[PDB]
Enzyme design. Structure first.
Site, PDB file in Angstrom:
ATOM      1  N   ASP A   8      46.854  29.368  56.389  1.00 24.67           N
ATOM      2  CA  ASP A   8      46.517  30.792  56.104  1.00 24.67           C
ATOM      3  C   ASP A   8      45.780  31.381  57.315  1.00 24.67           C
ATOM      4  O   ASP A   8      45.341  30.666  58.249  1.00 24.67           O
ATOM      5  CB  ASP A   8      45.721  30.965  54.810  1.00 24.67           C
ATOM      6  N   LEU A   9      45.679  32.712  57.361  1.00 20.21           N
ATOM      7  CA  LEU A   9      45.020  33.397  58.415  1.00 20.21           C
ATOM      8  C   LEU A   9      43.553  33.637  58.015  1.00 20.21           C
ATOM      9  O   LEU A   9      42.629  33.031  58.552  1.00 20.21           O
ATOM     10  CB  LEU A   9      45.793  34.691  58.698  1.00 20.21           C
ATOM     11  N   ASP A  10      43.312  34.503  57.019  1.00 23.63           N
ATOM     12  CA  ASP A  10      41.946  34.836  56.596  1.00 23.63           C
ATOM     13  C   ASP A  10      41.262  33.620  55.969  1.00 23.63           C
ATOM     14  O   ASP A  10      41.813  32.922  55.095  1.00 23.63           O
ATOM     15  CB  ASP A  10      41.993  35.955  55.550  1.00 23.63           C
ATOM     16  N   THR A  16      39.641  38.311  58.360  1.00 25.30           N
ATOM     17  CA  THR A  16      40.203  39.659  58.198  1.00 25.30           C
ATOM     18  C   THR A  16      39.524  40.408  57.045  1.00 25.30           C
ATOM     19  O   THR A  16      39.590  41.648  56.968  1.00 25.30           O
ATOM     20  CB  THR A  16      41.714  39.592  57.956  1.00 25.30           C
ATOM     21  N   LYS A  45      38.715  42.126  46.951  1.00 21.11           N
ATOM     22  CA  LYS A  45      39.379  41.066  47.756  1.00 21.11           C
ATOM     23  C   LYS A  45      40.575  40.504  46.985  1.00 21.11           C
ATOM     24  O   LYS A  45      40.432  40.161  45.825  1.00 21.11           O
ATOM     25  CB  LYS A  45      38.443  39.878  48.022  1.00 21.11           C
ATOM     26  N   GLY A  46      41.735  40.440  47.649  1.00 24.24           N
ATOM     27  CA  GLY A  46      42.914  39.845  47.145  1.00 24.24           C
ATOM     28  C   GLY A  46      43.542  40.573  45.955  1.00 24.24           C
ATOM     29  O   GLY A  46      44.322  39.953  45.244  1.00 24.24           O
ATOM     30  N   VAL A  47      43.202  41.850  45.708  1.00 23.51           N
ATOM     31  CA  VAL A  47      43.906  42.653  44.649  1.00 23.51           C
ATOM     32  C   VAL A  47      44.730  43.737  45.346  1.00 23.51           C
ATOM     33  O   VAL A  47      44.585  43.973  46.551  1.00 23.51           O
ATOM     34  CB  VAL A  47      42.969  43.250  43.573  1.00 23.51           C
ATOM     35  N   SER A 114      50.653  33.465  55.609  1.00 25.26           N
ATOM     36  CA  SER A 114      49.646  34.514  55.283  1.00 25.26           C
ATOM     37  C   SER A 114      50.324  35.758  54.695  1.00 25.26           C
ATOM     38  O   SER A 114      51.403  36.126  55.119  1.00 25.26           O
ATOM     39  CB  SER A 114      48.903  34.901  56.527  1.00 25.26           C
ATOM     40  N   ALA A 115      49.671  36.372  53.707  1.00 23.35           N
ATOM     41  CA  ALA A 115      50.101  37.652  53.220  1.00 23.35           C
ATOM     42  C   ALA A 115      49.769  38.807  54.187  1.00 23.35           C
ATOM     43  O   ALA A 115      50.191  39.931  53.916  1.00 23.35           O
ATOM     44  CB  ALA A 115      49.481  37.888  51.875  1.00 23.35           C
ATOM     45  N   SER A 116      49.080  38.558  55.310  1.00 27.64           N
ATOM     46  CA  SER A 116      48.765  39.626  56.261  1.00 27.64           C
ATOM     47  C   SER A 116      50.032  40.328  56.771  1.00 27.64           C
ATOM     48  O   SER A 116      50.880  39.690  57.379  1.00 27.64           O
ATOM     49  CB  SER A 116      47.968  39.117  57.431  1.00 27.64           C
ATOM     50  N   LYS A 117      50.082  41.652  56.670  1.00 26.62           N
ATOM     51  CA  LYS A 117      51.165  42.388  57.273  1.00 26.62           C
ATOM     52  C   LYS A 117      50.949  42.604  58.779  1.00 26.62           C
ATOM     53  O   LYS A 117      51.804  43.177  59.445  1.00 26.62           O
ATOM     54  CB  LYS A 117      51.315  43.751  56.585  1.00 26.62           C
ATOM     55  N   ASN A 118      49.867  42.057  59.336  1.00 30.06           N
ATOM     56  CA  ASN A 118      49.533  42.214  60.746  1.00 30.06           C
ATOM     57  C   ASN A 118      49.346  40.830  61.382  1.00 30.06           C
ATOM     58  O   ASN A 118      48.765  40.713  62.420  1.00 30.06           O
ATOM     59  CB  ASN A 118      48.265  43.054  60.933  1.00 30.06           C
ATOM     60  N   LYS A 145      50.736  34.386  46.617  1.00 30.88           N
ATOM     61  CA  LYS A 145      49.920  33.287  46.114  1.00 30.88           C
ATOM     62  C   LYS A 145      49.276  33.724  44.801  1.00 30.88           C
ATOM     63  O   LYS A 145      48.868  34.883  44.688  1.00 30.88           O
ATOM     64  CB  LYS A 145      48.842  32.927  47.130  1.00 30.88           C
ATOM     65  N   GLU A 169      43.729  26.069  53.478  1.00 28.78           N
ATOM     66  CA  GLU A 169      43.341  27.315  52.737  1.00 28.78           C
ATOM     67  C   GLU A 169      41.874  27.276  52.326  1.00 28.78           C
ATOM     68  O   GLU A 169      41.253  26.198  52.267  1.00 28.78           O
ATOM     69  CB  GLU A 169      44.229  27.465  51.505  1.00 28.78           C
ATOM     70  N   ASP A 170      41.329  28.469  52.088  1.00 31.05           N
ATOM     71  CA  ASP A 170      39.947  28.631  51.612  1.00 31.05           C
ATOM     72  C   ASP A 170      39.881  29.214  50.201  1.00 31.05           C
ATOM     73  O   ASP A 170      38.757  29.392  49.711  1.00 31.05           O
ATOM     74  CB  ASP A 170      39.148  29.526  52.544  1.00 31.05           C
TER      75      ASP A 170
END
Ligand code: MG
EC number: 5.4.2.6
Length: 218
Positions: A8-10, A16, A45-47, A114-118, A145, A169-170
């Site tokens: 994962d990224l964040d 992020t 966060k995460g919604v 990652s779900a990041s679009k960036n 996720k 993952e965190d």
């Protein structure tokens, strides 16, 4: 030995969440709503953007049109893209760069899940792109996720099965996604948060190639 590491990224590579928080706070300020602080942000966060914006509007009992709702959501996103222009190699979490180097020199595949679009942008600004074999495109995955889809997509994109992989993952939802993909999770954070059935490390400085190898061998 495992053949890939799915990141994962964040919360693993970088933070992020800080920038989403700043984007929402800036929006809330722009439209004169108080109460968007780091504690309140745990409800954001995460919604979905929709959920988040609902919660913020409720702080002042503010009603909006569908057109106004869409504009506010766009504004938050613009704010976020502006705030991440700051990101640099200085934002990489401890141990992560060395881990990527070691993985790469041992011919282990490296993928972002990652779900990041960036994500591509962020990895370029942090000077990590060169280490990544694939970045899973969240736009091309059917379920977020804790569904395993993005981890399966990341593994497949580097030519491996998830059962040949470790996932890092965190988050509870991320650990569940790794488990259901067939990959081996190694969490970062607290067992109180992530469960007693997985290996957890207190911070990313513990994610070393030698540690991942030892965990795999169990
Ligand atoms: Mg995470």
């Amino acid at each position: 030995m495992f053949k890939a590491v799915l990141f994962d990224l964040d919360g693993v590579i970088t933070d992020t969440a800080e920038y989403h928080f700043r984007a929402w706070k800036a929006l809330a300020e722009e439209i004169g709503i108080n109460g968007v602080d780091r504690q309140f942000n745990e409800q954001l966060k995460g919604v979905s953007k929709e959920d988040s914006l609902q919660k913020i509007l409720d702080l002042a009992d503010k009603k909006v049109s569908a057109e106004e709702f869409k504009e506010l959501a766009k504004r938050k996103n613009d704010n976020y893209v502006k705030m991440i222009q700051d990101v640099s190699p200085a934002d990489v979490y401890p141990g992560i760069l060395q881990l990527l180097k070691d993985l790469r020199s041992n011919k282990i595949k490296i993928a972002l899940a990652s779900a990041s679009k960036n994500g591509p942008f962020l990895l370029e600004r942090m000077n990590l792109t060169g280490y990544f074999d694939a970045i899973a495109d969240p736009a091309e995955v059917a379920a977020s996720k804790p569904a395993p889809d993005i981890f399966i997509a990341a593994a497949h994109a580097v030519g491996v099965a998830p059962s040949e992989s470790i996932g890092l993952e965190d988050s509870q939802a991320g650990i569940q996604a790794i488990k259901d993909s067939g990959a081996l999770p190694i969490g970062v954070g607290r067992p109180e948060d992530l469960g007693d059935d997985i290996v957890i490390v207190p911070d990313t400085s513990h994610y070393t190639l030698e540690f991942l190898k030892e965990v795999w061998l169990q």
